[PDB]
Write a protein that binds this DNA or RNA. Structure first.
Length: 48
DNA sequence: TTTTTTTTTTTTTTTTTTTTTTTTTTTTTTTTCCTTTTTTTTTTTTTTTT
C-alpha cells in the first residue's frame, strides 16, 4: 500500500504493455456558456 | 281488353389495382468548398476615307 505501507492481501498482476494516447483530450471538449451570441433568424443560441 | 312475364336500365356495392404520400434515434467535435457563367446586347475605341 502506498499510503500505509501494508502488504496487499491479494497478489496483483503487473507488467509492461503498449498503450496509445488518443486525440480526444478534455481541453478540446470542455464547454460552458452563460450568455453570448444568438442566431440572426430565431434569436436562439449558436452551434458548437 | 287486362295481367303476367321477359327484357332493359340504372344502382349500389365489391374487389382488385394503381397512385400518392409520408416517414425513417439523441447529442457532440473537427475540416474543406462554394457563396456563377457563358450569351447576348450595348457602348466605347480605333482605323480608314474624302
Amino acid at each position: 500500500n502506498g499510503h500505509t505501507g501494508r502488504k496487499i492481501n491479494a497478489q496483483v498482476f503487473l507488467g509492461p504493455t503498449y498503450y496509445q494516447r488518443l486525440k480526444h483530450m478534455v481541453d478540446d471538449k470542455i464547454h460552458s456558456r452563460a450568455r453570448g451570441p444568438v442566431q440572426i433568424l430565431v434569436r436562439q443560441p449558436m452551434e458548437g
